[PDB]
Amino acid sequence: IPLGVVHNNTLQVSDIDKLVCRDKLSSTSQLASVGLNLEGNGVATDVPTATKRWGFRAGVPPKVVNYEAGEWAENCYNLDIKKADGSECLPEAPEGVRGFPRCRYVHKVSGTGPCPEGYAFHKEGAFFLYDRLASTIIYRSTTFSEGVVAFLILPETK
Amino acid sequence: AKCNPNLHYWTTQDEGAAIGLAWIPYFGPAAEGIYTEGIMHNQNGLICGLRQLANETTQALQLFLRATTELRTFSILNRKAIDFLLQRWGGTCHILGPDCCIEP
Amino acid sequence: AKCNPNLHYWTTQDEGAAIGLAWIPYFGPAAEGIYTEGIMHNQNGLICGLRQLANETTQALQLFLRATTELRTFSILNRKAIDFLLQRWGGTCHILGPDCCIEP
């Protein structure tokens, strides 16, 4: 897994075979996992393009990773979606998982559509941000933002 | 590439904010109010770079999530520290050596 | 004489295919097709002795599972990694000592 380093306010990357002793790790607090929303990358934040980026897939188990820090989203998505028979496309939110804390706009989309699969993944591969918990799959009735996570080392004390 | 130079981040400081008085669960804050706000700006290299790095990390991280059978992986951050220490300290540390960090 | 010299193993992939496009879960393979296969053979000692290690390890491992209240413990291997560093660098490291890994 790639690891970025910050020395005197400019991030350089430290490759794994390479070894720098000058770099200092004092504590675990220095290390951090951060989610970043897609809004920053200039992708379209409107609903029609967003519903197009997401897609359903089966045979693939869900995976969850934690991120301590996250970014304020101008756009947040909450999903309630059912089929013509009334069955639910997305699973109920598991325990310990909550919606995105900071959302300027929460778009609610409710309509019927074909469920072709058991779970929902991002086609581009972006994680769905939640409260400090990133999932590759969408959950019902939970505000989320589209984003990706990185791990960095902070030189807080020298 | 369109990059947002302004970084407005919400997070939960560990010792950052050891204010106290909220540990007690009855009177502790609600899930919505626990978070703290911060802003990093006036830097073109770091903010743009952070967005990029997460973007590249998604690959190795995805292969990692698929590989591990745990539904939720919180042990990702700790492994890097282990590798960091093992890379220097794990081998026999020879004084005045390339892998070893000892200086007289 | 009951040992199976041959070893046909199914396993996970760490860095096998770091091509950069199967990591996405949507176009990624199903849970069933992700595993890799490998074979180790024509070695009597290496193969037969190992079934033996796991077989004996089961003993020490069980008491640990009983001891830990965690329903699922993924940290055993990693704890062992912790212990490795602790046995050597945990205590004052003396040059040319029996415990310390330091050579002039």
Epitope: P2, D15 | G49, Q52, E56 | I19, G20, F27
Partner: antibody
Amino acid sequence: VQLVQSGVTLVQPGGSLRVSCAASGFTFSSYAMSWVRQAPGKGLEWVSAISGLGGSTYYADSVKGRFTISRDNSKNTLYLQMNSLRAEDTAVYYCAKDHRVWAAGYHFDYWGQGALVTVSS
Amino acid sequence: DIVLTQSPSTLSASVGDRVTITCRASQSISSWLAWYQQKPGEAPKLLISDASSLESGVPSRFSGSGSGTEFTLTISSLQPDDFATYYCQQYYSSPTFGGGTKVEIKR
């Protein structure tokens, strides 16, 4: 938006050689670079890749042992340090840049002219 | 791992002829595919990406199609600059190149 490989090079078995791919006319660090070798009368073969940032390096099964790829975003330069060379590794090496994806994928639009490396000894 | 294959290795054609090369992968790599062009002694040149989207600066006559396991490169009209070796690449797995289809005018 032009790339410049090494002009001419000659080596021996198990020898060490550096191929330098200069990049200019467009932003470097933004994109991820890779090497591709072409043996005479043979199809192209993927050699090594490095992330746009440089944190992740990737090598092929055949070459993972004896090759090393590295980059400097400041000099806008890509170095391929080649060690333990073999006769099979004798080829024209091309250094390319990404077609559409930004440090996400390994597409190639613009190719270098190629750098000749001969291990015949 | 995964290796793709080409049907015409050498295809005898003439100027302005509709030309179709068929490249079928062993596994199903969906829509992720690319086509290249290499003239003798010249660096490989990008023809098409994602099998649907065309690169800029590229002549409009060339087109590509197919999904999953099947793919087809079609040229409605052939030109003097089209006689070079053509390969197919899939990014789903190990970066891999096809045998190549060389174009000739030995009618």
